[PDB]
Design a protein around this ligand. Sequence first.
Ligand SMILES: COc1cc2cc(c1OC)OCCOC/C=C/CCOC(=O)[C@@H]1CCCCN1C(=O)[C@H]2C1CCCCC1
Length: 128
Amino acid sequence: GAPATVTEQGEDITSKKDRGVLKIVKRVGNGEETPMIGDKVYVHYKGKLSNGKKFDSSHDRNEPFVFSLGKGQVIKAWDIGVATMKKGEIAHLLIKPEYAYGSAGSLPKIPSNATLFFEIELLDFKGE
Ligand SMILES: COc1cc2cc(c1OC)OCCOC/C=C/CCOC(=O)[C@@H]1CCCCN1C(=O)[C@H]2C1CCCCC1
C-alpha cells in the first residue's frame, strides 16, 4: 500500500537523515514559494496509523485544517514536511515516532512508538 511505497521510494527530508520523515510528491503544485515558519497554512489531509488501526481526515470535519507552521500546533513531521510543499501539491508522508508522538504516544488515538502515514494537500498559506 501507500505506506510501503513511501518506505521503499520516499525521500528522507530530515536534517539528521535518520529516515524519520519520508516524502513522495503525488501531485505537483505551482510557484516557487513554500511556507516559512510563522505562516498560516491551509491543508486538506487524510491520515492513519501505519498499521491501519485508526484514521483521520480533515474531511470528517467538513472544512480545511488551518495551522501556523512551527508554532507547535502540529507534530514535528508536519512542520518539516509541509514547509517543503508548494501551493496545490499533494504529498505522502511516512513518519517515525520521534517526529510524531514518541514513546509516550497520545492515547487513546495514538499508541506508543507509532509510525504515521498522511496524504496532505497544500491549499494555501499566508504570512503572519
Ligand atoms: C493526537 O490527537 C489527534 C491526532 C490526530 C487527529 C486528532 C487528534 O485529536 C486532537 O483529532 C482530529 C482533530 O485534531 C486536529 C489536529 C490535531 C493536532 C495533533 O495532530 C497532529 O499534529 C497531526 C497532524 C495534523 C493532522 C492531525 N494529526 C494527527 O496526528 C491525527 C492522527 C493521524 C493518525 C491517525 C489518527 C489521528
